[PDB]
Design a protein around this ligand. Structure first.
Ligand code: NA
Ligand code: NA
Lengths: 187, 187
């Protein structure tokens, strides 16, 4: 029985911090749904890469629950995630069922917006620290990947492989993560 | 006067080894054209990420020349690049005008197919070494990024940031590469 991931893709997402997790998760045999926040239409990412989602979030959310919900990076993408009632509901449900929530770069700021995982140790992109820490609802970490129970966070495009492999390890185990890692030619 | 990059996107491209160079080059202020080998329609990459090109290769090739031609990774993507007469012509022209040619992962095997840069030191994904070395027309390297004159090669998804920054350094210089690198949170 394969694990399933929901990756929520909004306008202004950081395409590296989106594609790396999708691809690495699929290499691990996770069934990944790239769901467009705004619908099924193509999404213009932060550096103008245009990605066609697999489904609208509206449709994808009806096919839950998922073993992980992934919030990609991107400052404007995260702002869109933070403003979405649908995202709020998905994250609240996932938290309530004790399912993994993974967020990278500015992505974790949507956790703050939706009051998810307060009291957790988290990291973000350095430039998003102040936003994440407004109100002191989390404890901040400068680790490249941070995991506190079901809240898994990471810092930037350059930490995306580590972030993705941490998701794989959490879902499918250390051996699968190591097997997927080797052909990537990571340092 | 900004530098310009042509990134040739074929079905089966490795999406990480495509998006990382596009994004990093755009961060460096390079004008990047993501050109679809087969036309302007969306391209299904190796791990099912679907990317909409900026233009068809047919149109993009008429707007050359470019300061760099980039051949992304992906074993099936590289096979498609290797079979294309349009790619052959673009690479031959670029080589003749002493312009940079950058290829990652399986991408360099298209250089072999099109008889580009023979006698150069190159690297590839380890799994593509035998294909690249058929006939002994290159000298092989296990360096993560290899540059021999105008032929710039690299190994895999995990070397994509280094590859992209080497393109940036070649076009826009070391200082710009360092400036672009820092916010990526690379190790
Ligand atoms: Na990483
Ligand atoms: Na790299």
């Amino acid at each position: 029985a394969s694990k399933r991931a929901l990756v929520i893709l909004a306008k202004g997402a950081e395409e590296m911090a989106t594609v790396i997790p999708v691809d690495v998760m699929r290499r691990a045999g996770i069934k990944v749904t790239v769901a467009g926040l705004a619908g099924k239409d193509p999404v213009q990412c932060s550096r103008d890469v245009v990605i066609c989602p697999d489904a609208s979030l509206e449709d994808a959310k009806k096919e839950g629950p998922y073993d992980v919900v992934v919030l990609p990076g991107g400052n404007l993408g995260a702002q869109n995630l933070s403003e979405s009632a649908a995202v709020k509901e998905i994250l609240k449900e996932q938290e309530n069922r004790k399912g993994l929530i993974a967020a990278i770069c500015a992505g974790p700021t949507a956790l703050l917006a939706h009051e998810i995982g307060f009291g957790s140790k988290v990291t973000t992109h350095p430039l998003a620290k102040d936003k994440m820490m407004n109100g002191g609802h989390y404890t901040y970490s400068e680790n490249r990947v941070e995991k506190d129970g079901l809240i898994l966070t990471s810092r930037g495009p350059g930490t995306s492989f580590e972030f993705a492999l941490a998701i794989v390890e959490a879902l499918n185990g250390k051996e699968v993560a190591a097997q997927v890692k080797a052909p990537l030619v990571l340092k």
